[PDB]
Amino acid sequence: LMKIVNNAFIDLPAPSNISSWWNFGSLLGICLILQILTGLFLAMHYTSDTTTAFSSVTHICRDVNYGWIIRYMHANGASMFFICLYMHVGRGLYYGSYTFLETWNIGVILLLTVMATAFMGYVLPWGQMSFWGATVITNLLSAIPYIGTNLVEWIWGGFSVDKATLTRFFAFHFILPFIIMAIAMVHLLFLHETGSNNPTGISSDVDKIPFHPYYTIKDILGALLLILALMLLVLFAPDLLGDPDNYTPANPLNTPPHIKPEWYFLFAYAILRSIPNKLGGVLALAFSILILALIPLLHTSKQRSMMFRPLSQCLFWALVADLLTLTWIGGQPVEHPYITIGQLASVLYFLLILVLMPTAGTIENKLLKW
Amino acid sequence: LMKIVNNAFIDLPAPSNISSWWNFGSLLGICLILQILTGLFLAMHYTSDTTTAFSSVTHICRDVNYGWIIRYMHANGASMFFICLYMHVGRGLYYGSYTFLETWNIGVILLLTVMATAFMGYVLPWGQMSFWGATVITNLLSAIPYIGTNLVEWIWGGFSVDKATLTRFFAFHFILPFIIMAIAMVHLLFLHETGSNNPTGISSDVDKIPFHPYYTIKDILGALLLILALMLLVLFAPDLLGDPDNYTPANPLNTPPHIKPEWYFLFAYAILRSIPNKLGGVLALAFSILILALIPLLHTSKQRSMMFRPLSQCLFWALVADLLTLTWIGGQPVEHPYITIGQLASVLYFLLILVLMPTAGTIENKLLKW
Amino acid sequence: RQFGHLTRVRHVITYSLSPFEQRAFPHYFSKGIPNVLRRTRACILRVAPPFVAFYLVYTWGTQEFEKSKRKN
Amino acid sequence: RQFGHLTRVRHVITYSLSPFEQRAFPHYFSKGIPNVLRRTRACILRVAPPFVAFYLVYTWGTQEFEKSKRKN
Amino acid sequence: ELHPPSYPWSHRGLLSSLDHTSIRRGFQVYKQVCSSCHSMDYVAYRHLVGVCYTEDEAKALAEEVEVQDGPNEDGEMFMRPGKLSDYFPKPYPNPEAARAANNGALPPDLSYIVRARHGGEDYVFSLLTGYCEPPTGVSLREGLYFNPYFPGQAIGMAPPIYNEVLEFDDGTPATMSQVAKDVCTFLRWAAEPEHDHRKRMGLKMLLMMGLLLPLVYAMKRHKWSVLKSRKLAYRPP
Amino acid sequence: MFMRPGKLSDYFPKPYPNPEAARAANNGALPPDLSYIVRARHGGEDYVFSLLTG
Amino acid sequence: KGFSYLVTATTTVGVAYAAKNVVSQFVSSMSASADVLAMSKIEIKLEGKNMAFKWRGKPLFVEIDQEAAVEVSQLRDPQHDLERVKKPEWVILIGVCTHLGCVPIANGGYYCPCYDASGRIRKGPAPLNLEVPSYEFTSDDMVIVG
Amino acid sequence: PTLTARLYSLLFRRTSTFALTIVVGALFFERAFDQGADAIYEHINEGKLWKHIKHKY
Numbered sequence A, B: 001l002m003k004i005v006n007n008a009f010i011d012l013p014a015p016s017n018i019s020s021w022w023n024f025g026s027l028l029g030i031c032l033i034l035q036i037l038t039g040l041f042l043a044m045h046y047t048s049d050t051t052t053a054f055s056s057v058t059h060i061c062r063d064v065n066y067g068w069i070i071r072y073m074h075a076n077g078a079s080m081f082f083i084c085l086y087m088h089v090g091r092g093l094y095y096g097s098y099t100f101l102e103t104w105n106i107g108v109i110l111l112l113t114v115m116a117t118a119f120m121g122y123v124l125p126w127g128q129m130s131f132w133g134a135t136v137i138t139n140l141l142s143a144i145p146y147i148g149t150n151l152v153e154w155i156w157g158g159f160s161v162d163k164a165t166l167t168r169f170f171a172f173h174f175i176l177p178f179i180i181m182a183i184a185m186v187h188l189l190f191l192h193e194t195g196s197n198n199p200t201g202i203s204s205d206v207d208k209i210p211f212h213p214y215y216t217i218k219d220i221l222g223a224l225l226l227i228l229a230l231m232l233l234v235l236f237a238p239d240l241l242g243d244p245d246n247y248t249p250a251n252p253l254n255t256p257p258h259i260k261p262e263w264y265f266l267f268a269y270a271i272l273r274s275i276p277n278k279l280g281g282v283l284a285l286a287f288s289i290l291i292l293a294l295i296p297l298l299h300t301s302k303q304r305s306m307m308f309r310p311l312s313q314c315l316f317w318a319l320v321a322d323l324l325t326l327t328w329i330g331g332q333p334v335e336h337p338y339i340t341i342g343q344l345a346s347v348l349y350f351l352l353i354l355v356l357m358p359t360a361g362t363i364e365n366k367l368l369k370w
Numbered sequence C, D: 001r002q003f004g005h006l007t008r009v010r011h012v013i014t015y016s017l018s019p020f021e022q023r024a025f026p027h028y029f030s031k032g033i034p035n036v037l038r039r040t041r042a043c044i045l046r047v048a049p050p051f052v053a054f055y056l057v058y059t060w061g062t063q064e065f066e067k068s069k070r071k072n
Numbered sequence E: 001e002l003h004p005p006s007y008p009w010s011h012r013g014l015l016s017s018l019d020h021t022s023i024r025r026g027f028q029v030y031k032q033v034c035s036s037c038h039s040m041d042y043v044a045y046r047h048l049v050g051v052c053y054t055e056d057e058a059k060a061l062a063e064e065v066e067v068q069d070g071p072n073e074d075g076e077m078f079m080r081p082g083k084l085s086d087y088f089p090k091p092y093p094n095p096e097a098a099r100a101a102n103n104g105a106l107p108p109d110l111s112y113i114v115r116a117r118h119g120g121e122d123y124v125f126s127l128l129t130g131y132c133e134p135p136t137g138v139s140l141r142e143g144l145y146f147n148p149y150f151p152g153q154a155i156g157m158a159p160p161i162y163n164e165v166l167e168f169d170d171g172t173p174a175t176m177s178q179v180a181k182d183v184c185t186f187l188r189w190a191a192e193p194e195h196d197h198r199k200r201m202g203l204k205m206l207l208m209m210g211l212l213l214p215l216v217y218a219m220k221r222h223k224w225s226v227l228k229s230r231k232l233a234y235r236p237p
Numbered sequence F: 001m002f003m004r005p006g007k008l009s010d011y012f013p014k015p016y017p018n019p020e021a022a023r024a025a026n027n028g029a030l031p032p033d034l035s036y037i038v039r040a041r042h043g044g045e046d047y048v049f050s051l052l053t054g
Numbered sequence G: 001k002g003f004s005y006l007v008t009a010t011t012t013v014g015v016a017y018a019a020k021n022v023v024s025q026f027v028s029s030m031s032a033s034a035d036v037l038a039m040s041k042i043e044i045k046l047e048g049k050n051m052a053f054k055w056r057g058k059p060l061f062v063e064i065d066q067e068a069a070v071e072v073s074q075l076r077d078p079q080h081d082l083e084r085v086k087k088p089e090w091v092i093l094i095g096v097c098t099h100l101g102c103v104p105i106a107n108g109g110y111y112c113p114c115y116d117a118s119g120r121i122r123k124g125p126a127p128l129n130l131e132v133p134s135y136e137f138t139s140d141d142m143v144i145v146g
Numbered sequence H: 001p002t003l004t005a006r007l008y009s010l011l012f013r014r015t016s017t018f019a020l021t022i023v024v025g026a027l028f029f030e031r032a033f034d035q036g037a038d039a040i041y042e043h044i045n046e047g048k049l050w051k052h053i054k055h056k057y
């Protein structure tokens, strides 16, 4: 009598109209379980020490029987694991699922719990962009008054990134996914009290359907296509999203030309490089994420979806462009054309979310005599 | 609306008479959570490579701020974690809780899942008894026909215990406890369908009581005493249950005089050294554990407890002596007095469980005109 | 929650066939295609223009970035 | 499961006090002690003898183990 | 074999600490006798600070021995005076040279020797202080000597100590026993430097646990008191 | 420690014992390793051929 | 009441004592070990040249009239030369940029692709000039940083 | 009345006030206990610890 719990996988009421956008919730359940198996088999041959880590990856990629595929099913198994989110989130914002506050506020807590885990995971190969990535990004906490000089040295276990900084990331990294797996079952738990949303935003109690033959096979399809776009990168462009300077071991006395995190952080980084004031830059960085927790308190339209909200559609897809911009600016260096652009886009990100998109639904209500 | 699940911790029906013996179920919940925090902080300073592991423990025990306490709250945090089991099991056998088959068969699966984890965990310091422990004990699978020469080399990742044998244990070790934590919540789940047993073996639906003020504070007491007997060893006899040859680094070309696992396996080991035939020794070893899954199919008395079964009491406490014997013989060398004893005790272990104890309740039924 | 008492419905009828008795690809090209174009024109003017705007600021920013690094 | 319908009970009475109105250690030595000895004698003959037997085979096996290693 | 005897060491007490003054003497032994033939890889001159030597005294000893450090800008490696961060200098470059220099025998490290030998420091004092001629019927090969406190009673460890084998700084008479006492005290610090700080927590614990155990035991028999005192009756119609 | 003929398990012999000797033998400059040079430089092998041939 | 509530209160005191310690033990574990703290302080050292040396896993860098001739006010970060050095022929500076953490190249002063020979800044994105550690000269040849 | 009754009326009645006692108690307890504990240990191990001999060097 576990399998009363499998009714959430078999006899679960679910709507009928939901298109591919909802599959991205399940796929994380695959990427996560996929990534754990791969990263585990990397642990068998990884060493957490600085004199042996970078080589340890080589032991995998060279001497091991198919050790190399696992590295790239796993690194790029994180990249695809964030294409899935950002679309899994955009659904929740565009189709207005954030009214399930209990889930959404936990959706945030999964995001942060992850997007620090990749940061730790990117260190472990112990190359330049690994080291220098962590060197820059930890120092941002130094901007805080009265604490930062103490907290950063504590996280480092010293006065600069070194051995004990590495070894603890490996332990903070190879644990949190087992904490993330818990919060997912939690995250679903509050969802299975309410049942999922549809493109319309309307109560779908009338046209529910089971889950066992219909969405299962739909998830088998959607999972299959995911394994394509992953393995293509593994089998046709593995260094694509990477950064080749990583394949030089760490040299703390030789700074690389372009320091940057990987593509999935960069929109955050561009916001930071926009502001000259260091501390004020930080609170913008953390706020670019946490602002998701301010969305439902800024809901204004008496409708839920955006299939039936024209002005918000135009603003929504504008926000996506602002993101894509910030992804691009962060990857590119800091000069007078790109500085100016990076400033404008960052202002749009906060402006568009807080002001226009609420303002729209207010206007949209007025046209409908509300 | 998680906290409907906390009704298993607050408003749970529980009997009224249950003495200390049941606390040992909860304490594992403390040791486990305790041990995970400690072993984690050991991961921050441990290195999984052979040229650096043994020193890595020294980095902890010497240079780290209170790194040393954590090693001994953790090693001996495994010893106490098996005093708790063997009493947590003996309850289940003496008070006859094994009628909850769904839990018991999972109680076994927790035991094995653990008692291999300590084996892996004892390797990681990379000393003599660590290495030679793993060298002897893996070879036992070589006794199996047509597989063992292939399987053992696979587990080793080579042809003898070496680097890749170590690094994978560290990953098989620092994961399973997060799997054990799952099975516990499972293990309870089938228990909270039935509610716990009492010393009498009688249905206690009439004299149930809540759990929030009564057993909570009882578990706070029982937990406190546990932290005593742990920290005493840490603060008054840390090398007690240890084995000092471990504090010599591994030397595969220098066999120690006394090879043995630690105290908590030894009764298993004595059974093995008893039998000269190698393979036949193995199937006795695994059967000394798995025999727990044959208990309920050997229940014969129409009663449940053993407070009201005199003959089974005398046989039960005899079984304990046979165990304590096997714990002692395994730690001691192999010579003509101890060989003879180790044979007799091992026969009693299987004989007493399979024959006498069932036979008793049959007789006990006859006296009661059943 | 479960089926059976989710809400209340009255005087509603559903008809359905067995999948073994109907094609899985009926009018897949014959009718599906214009639905896509219909599904396309219905929304494309709301998706395109910010990304259209992106491609321009991408190039203009790129070229101006180049020109900045060249010389007097 | 929960309280309320676990089973059926009839014509049974319970009396109880408030813990703030009664001692926590009543007759702790005066009455508790002989209960222990009563609780002891009731069971001790069933717990002792195998462990009594253990202590003997421990010594006899120990001494015989010693004597084996000495000489002719 | 021979079970060594147990002694009234000063630190045998559950709250007794080490004679730090004796640890000072014990280091002088290892340094003038054993440091030429035994390694101690897992200790630094800084660990001696605040225990048996101070900062400056240990720092002076760091500057007595030369240590191989520093890839020169020319691309070579040189020797410098040691510092406090430096570990105890290994006498030999590799164990084979040791087996070469001791008739195939291996001087063991001594970081953990106390806690790597049954009996502990009691063994070691009896070991050094147990040398004697072999009994009749017994004969050993050249290089190896007799000592009852070893398996097989045959070791390469020639007499390291004896009366006035060295001199102490505090004016102590350097009897073979006085020497072997202090060194074993030092090694117990090496294998367990937490010893002196272990017990202080052991003291803090028992005083707290002396309090929390009865108090918690009261709240238990406060809350359970309802049930230890309840009563029942049976009033059918 | 002595010298022997290499075997197959042996890795490619390092020309220099340490990078400082390299900086010493090349006017402070460091010849980089070449295990990952293709995948450690933007443009890849196209860069390298143009580099030597440029 | 006050008697019974005193039992739990005094108990709570003893808990929080222990709970303060073990946490402080653990958090102290994650802080810098003894090994790092030694190397963090002990930094011994020995014309017209500058060398990049390691210290705390960071770079450490080690004409006079010319640098003195450079005006103080014209710097974005006005500082006199001897305000940055204890002796004029020893420039001890730290290869970390105050704009964002990056290393400048040595040598006619510095350049960062992410200053003068004295360490002060002239042109560029750098908000502040090179920082000077707390050091001392024990002899005419030996130097101790921090 | 007794002291126990006075303590309850002022401190253990309000759970807000109650908690502040416990923190206040911990501070003076943390101070007092450590001083007394060390004194015993030193008294047992008098003349054996570093500071007891440090003055000589």
Ligand code: HEC
Pocket: E029, E033, E034, E037, E038, E102, E105, E106, E107, E108, E110, E113, E124, E127, E128, E150, E154, E155, E156, E157, E158, E159, E160, E161, E183
């Ligand atoms: C003359 C060189 C030499 C000196 C001086 C010396 N040792 Fe020994 N020691 C050895 C050698 C060689 C062995 C190897 C014994 C063997 O292989 O059986 C040994 C063995 C030992 C053993 C026994 C190891 C065991 O497993 O039983 C101890 C303990 C020890 N050394 C420590 C010491 C102590 C204590 C001293 C005096 C304070 C000392 N060393 C001085 C050379 C030396």
Ligand code: HEC
Pocket: F026, F029, F030, F031, F032, F034, F037, F048, F051, F052
């Ligand atoms: C005469 C010694 C010498 C030989 C022969 C030599 N190299 Fe170089 N190489 C160097 C040195 C020294 C550098 C350092 C360049 C620098 O520091 O800017 C260098 C730089 C390089 C670079 C560029 C590194 C970068 O980051 O841009 C590559 C690629 C390279 N070496 C590979 C090669 C190739 C390819 C060849 C010919 C097949 C070769 N080496 C032969 C000495 C040599």
Ligand code: HEM
Pocket: A032, A035, A036, A037, A038, A039, A040, A042, A043, A046, A057, A071, A074, A075, A078, A079, A081, A114, A117, A118, A120, A121, A122, A124, A125, A173, A174, A177, A180
């Ligand atoms: C759950 C969120 C996770 C994210 C976002 C993430 C992300 C990453 C990334 C991007 C890398 C860089 C790899 C490379 O550049 O080659 C990495 C490395 C690594 N990851 Fe993951 N990872 C996650 C989970 C895991 C898990 C569950 C494991 C193990 C079970 C794991 C094990 C490792 C290891 C050992 C490395 C270093 C080895 C290497 O990079 O070659 N990670 N992680």
Ligand code: HEM
Pocket: A021, A022, A023, A024, A025, A026, A027, A028, A029, A032, A085, A088, A089, A092, A097, A098, A100, A103, A104, A106, A107, A108, A110, A111, A180, A184, A187, A188, A191, A195, A196, A197, A198, A292
């Ligand atoms: C490890 C990370 C995650 C896991 C395992 C996970 C899992 C799931 C799954 C399987 C679903 C059901 C499918 C669906 O409704 O799309 C879901 C729903 C949802 N997720 Fe997550 N998700 C994760 C991340 C996130 C994040 C980062 C957010 C928000 C920032 C989020 C917000 C939501 C919301 C609002 C829903 C319900 C929306 C609806 O039903 O209409 N999730 N999640």
Ligand code: HEM
Pocket: B032, B035, B036, B037, B038, B039, B040, B042, B043, B046, B057, B071, B074, B075, B078, B081, B114, B117, B118, B121, B122, B124, B125, B173, B174, B177, B180
């Ligand atoms: C759950 C069942 C576990 C058992 C039975 C167990 C048992 C052991 C034992 C006996 C040792 C030997 C330590 C020593 O001799 O000093 C050990 C080592 C170790 N354990 Fe555990 N352990 C368990 C869980 C864990 C967990 C949960 C972690 C981390 C979260 C962990 C991390 C480690 C590490 C890193 C070592 C090697 C470091 C060292 O031994 O000093 N173990 N384990």
Ligand code: HEM
Pocket: B021, B022, B023, B024, B025, B026, B027, B028, B029, B032, B085, B088, B089, B092, B097, B098, B100, B103, B104, B106, B107, B108, B110, B111, B180, B184, B187, B188, B191, B195, B196, B197, B198, B292
């Ligand atoms: C990680 C290992 C374990 C955990 C976390 C765990 C946890 C618990 C807890 C909290 C209870 C309730 C308290 C109690 O009934 O005593 C329980 C009950 C029980 N356990 Fe486990 N236990 C573990 C190991 C085992 C093992 C090894 C066995 C059997 C070989 C076992 C068999 C049982 C049984 C039969 C019960 C219910 C007995 C009854 O209620 O009368 N458990 N377990």
Ligand SMILES: COc1ccc2c(O)c(C)c(-c3cncc(-c4ccc(OC(F)(F)F)cc4)c3)nc2c1
Pocket: A008, A014, A022, A025, A026, A027, A028, A029, A030, A188, A196, A215, A216, A219, A220, A221, A223
């Ligand atoms: C209607 O929308 C929903 C609503 C509720 C959902 C839910 O409660 C869960 C647990 C999941 C889910 C989460 N992880 C993984 C899977 C999965 C599906 C197919 C697989 O099979 C294979 F083909 F191998 F991928 C393997 C894993 C499903 N999806 C939900 C989708």
Ligand SMILES: COc1ccc2c(O)c(C)c(-c3cncc(-c4ccc(OC(F)(F)F)cc4)c3)nc2c1
Pocket: B008, B014, B022, B025, B026, B027, B028, B029, B030, B188, B196, B215, B216, B219, B220, B221, B223
């Ligand atoms: C009536 O018998 C039962 C019946 C059912 C039980 C059950 O379902 C659970 C989950 C548990 C339990 C499992 N792990 C840990 C604890 C725990 C208790 C006090 C703590 O508090 C502190 F003082 F810190 F130890 C900390 C943890 C309890 N005990 C059960 C005992």
